[PDB]
Amino acid sequence: SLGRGRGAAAAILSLGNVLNYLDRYTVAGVLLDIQQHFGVKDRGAGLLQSVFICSFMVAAPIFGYLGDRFNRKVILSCGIFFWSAVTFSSSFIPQQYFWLLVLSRGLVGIGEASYSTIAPTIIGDLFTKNTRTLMLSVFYFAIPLGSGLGYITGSSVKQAAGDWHWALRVSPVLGMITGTLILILVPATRTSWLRDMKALIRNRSYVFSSLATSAVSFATGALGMWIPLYLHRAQVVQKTAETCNSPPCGAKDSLIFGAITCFTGFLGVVTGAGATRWCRLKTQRADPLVCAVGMLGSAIFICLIFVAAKSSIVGAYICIFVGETLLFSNWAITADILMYVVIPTRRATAVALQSFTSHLLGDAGSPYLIGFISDLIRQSTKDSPLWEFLSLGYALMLCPFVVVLGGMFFLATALFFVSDRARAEQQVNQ
Ligand SMILES: CCCCCCCCCCc1ccc(-c2noc(CCCN)n2)cc1
User: Fold this and answer.
1) Are 397 and 307 a contacting pair, CB within 8 Å?
2) Exposed, middle or buried, 423 (CB in 10 Å: 0-12/13-18/19+)?
3) How many Å from the N-terminal Cα to the C-terminal Cα in the chain?
């Protein structure tokens, strides 16, 4: 009935999503200064993101529940105000205390989980059909954009202000403004869990696809959480004796990584769509096959980046470009597979299930696992920047391995995709 209001609501929701991801990844951008100032080792650095993801995983379903039974717009505004306040207050934590930052991360994760679980429901309720899917697409466009802007803002504010605290002191004002706008312009708005559990435990292609998504989450969490620090360590190790005065400044690598991520999000989605469209003419199980090929390519390039980074950095940058492109090529394809195999009646429930699983074996403790392994290698050898480099590299060498199992699981679901799709088709429509 009204177009301007719906358009403004979509715009403010998309801006809120951008802000959400920016606040999510600013800490990953600025972790080096935090680690240096607080005097902690890689264990706590991983623990930050691990606690964030754990809080998000725990708090998503209850927030969704409160969303469908109670009012959504007020809950959305309360959540954005909550994580904005916690983010602003986190910058004032003194050096002598560390667990304060971790609990602040947990509260921020709670707020972001509320926002992420709530907003798609209203953004899809407002519109319908082609308009709805276009609006959902422009909504989800915020992820590769949001992560990149988070890296960019963290690095830029660190470089300009000269102290890392201000990295958390530029976003909350935008958060409060976005809360006021979402309150002003936006118009106001399970069953048989046991049976769905029992039915879905027997869907083998569903299980294999969920495991593949878990492996992808593991890889992307570890990479997007640890790569800038590894690059900085490599740069300083090269600078040990290449010039003896070359700037090892960290404000030149995080920006490049952020811009690269913004590019590869869209690039990988586009190339995955093109590849699946091309390959659907040959066979019927082309989607898991192209997912598996993308996983194999990503594993290959993630293998050679950790070797190329020893000598040349531009080689590492192009390798990571190709790696994240081929890694993100399967985003929409996984959801398409899930849409195709699962019966409509439990469909939504199934989706939620996958999220839970993808947040348990994926990025729940993956950054902490990498930190733990790097620390274990550290204590067994000497302490030196060169050994910092090799220890972090050896710890991070675990990602292509799990990517290889992800590709194998996509092959496994490829074998049974046709049979499961046929069974789903026969069951529906009677
Ligand atoms: C280092 C930067 C890492 C940045 C990635 C962080 C991922 C966290 C959230 C997980 C996630 C991702 C993508 C999608 C999705 N994309 O498209 C569609 C359907 C479109 C139909 N035409 N669904 C859903 C959920």
Assistant:
1) no
2) middle
3) 37
Whether 366 is in the pocket of ligand 1, judged by its Cβ within 6 Å, is no
Which burial class, exposed, middle or buried, applies to 281 when counting CB atoms under 10 A from its CB (0-12, 13-18, 19+)? exposed
Return the best residue to mutate from 25, 57, 140, 340 for the ligand 1 pocket (most ligand atoms within 8 A of CB).
140
Going along the chain from its start, the domains and CATH numbers come out as: 1-189 (1.20.1250.20), 192-430 (1.20.1250.20)
CA nearest ligand 1 atom 1, residue = 224
427: burial class by Cβ within 10 Å (0-12, 13-18, 19+)? exposed
| Cα–Cα distance for residue pair 187/377, rounded to 1 Å | 55
Residue 332's Cβ-count burial label (10 Å; 0-12, 13-18, 19+) is middle
Is the beta carbon of 56 within 6 A of some atom in ligand 1?
Answer: no
CB 272 within 8 A of CB 216: no
Rounded CA gap, 405 and 212, in Å?
Answer: 8
For residue 273 and ligand 1, the question of a CB distance below 6 A is answered with no
For 75, the token pair is 């809950």
What contacts 415, CB < 8 A, 6 or more positions away? none
- Residue 127's Cβ-side half-sphere holds a number of Cα atoms within 13 Å equal to 22
DSSP class of residue 248 equals -
Resolution of this model in Å is 3.5
